[PDB]
Amino acid sequence: ESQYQVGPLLGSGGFGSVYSGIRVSDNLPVAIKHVEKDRISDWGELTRVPMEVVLLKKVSSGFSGVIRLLDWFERPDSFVLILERPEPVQDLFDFITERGALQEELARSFFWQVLEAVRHCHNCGVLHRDIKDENILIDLNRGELKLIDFGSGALLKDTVYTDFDGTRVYSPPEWIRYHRYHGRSAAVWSLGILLYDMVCGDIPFEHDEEIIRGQVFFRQRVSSECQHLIRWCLALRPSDRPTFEEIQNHPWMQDVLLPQETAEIHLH
Numbered sequence: 286e287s288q289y290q291v292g293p294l295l296g297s298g299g300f301g302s303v304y305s306g307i308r309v310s311d312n313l314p315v316a317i318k319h320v321e322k323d324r325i326s327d328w329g330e331l332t333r334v335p336m337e338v339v340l341l342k343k344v345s346s347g348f349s350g351v352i353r354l355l356d357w358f359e360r361p362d363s364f365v366l367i368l369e370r371p372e373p374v375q376d377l378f379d380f381i382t383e384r385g386a387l388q389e390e391l392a393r394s395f396f397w398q399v400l401e402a403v404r405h406c407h408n409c410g411v412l413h414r415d416i417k418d419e420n421i422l423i424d425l426n427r428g429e430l431k432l433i434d435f436g437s438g439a440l441l442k443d444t445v446y447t448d449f450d451g452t453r454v455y456s457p458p459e460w461i462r463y464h465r466y467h468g469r470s471a472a473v474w475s476l477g478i479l480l481y482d483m484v485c486g487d488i489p490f491e492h493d494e495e496i497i498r499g500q501v502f503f504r505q506r507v508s509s510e511c512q513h514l515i516r517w518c519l520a521l522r523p524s525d526r527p528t529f530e531e532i533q534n535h536p537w538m539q540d541v542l543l544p545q546e547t548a549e550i551h552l553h
């Protein structure tokens with residue numbers, strides 16, 4: 286390829302291999318993601334493409350809480366996706382690994398931005414299905430979070446999902462026990478795991494039994510309101526979980542900092 290200059294490997298795993306790149310035409314920072322054709326369980330179309338590209342095109346549209354797909358290419362054995370790349374950036378998993386449990390004010394700003402990103406995906410007919418710290422990029426200058434890696438997502442629908450291939454420890458008890466979930470309520474459970482992770486510095490449950498028991502213990506000092514929001518997101522019955530609107534109207538969620546204030550105060 287002559288359109289992009291390839292830089293260091295940023296990571297690899299279930300999502301494929303992602304390299305740092307630069308778009309040669311205007312020096313835009315990009316991430317260049319290679320997905321092997323035979324590791325794609327899930328195809329859509331517009332000629333057959335990974336669901337991931339279908340879902341990205343449906344959400345890649347002005348609102349910047351979701352990484353944008355700038356271009357894609359097909360190769361004999363893979364697809365290559367050209368994605369936005371903020372710079373400097375750190376994913377939330379590394380950030381929490383380095384900084385430990387986040388102060389509530391900072392978790393509140395981050396969590397709120399996740400919720401706007403996920404509402405956007407949903408408004409666009411897309412369910413992420415793998416919301417977790419490793420799939421959230423922090424633009425450290427602007428304090429803006431971006432959801433990445435739609436490679437386990439699906440078109441949003443209102444009937445039951447019986448397949449899943451996101452991250453188990455973020456998956457709800459109905460998936461664990463029955464291999465069934467509805468998209469919104471599973472997304473909210475993963476948001477409870479995510480919010481506990483932000484405020485405690487690690488995820489609450491490691492084991493199937495703990496997921497199914499849904500008993501939440503706090504190892505860090507966490508406000509009653511935050512604990513209540515988390516415990517609500519993690520209701521065992523899917524229909525007892527809050528909607529996005531109820532999450533965002535929760536008292537813990539009030540007075541969120543703007544992303545810019547967030548970076549000035551907490552990211553320097």
Ligand SMILES: NC(=O)c1ccc2cccc(O)c2n1
Nearest residue numbers: 295303316352368433434435
């Ligand atoms: N949607 C994507 O998987 C994606 C998009 C952009 C990325 C930027 C930096 C590091 C990454 O792992 C990235 N992954």
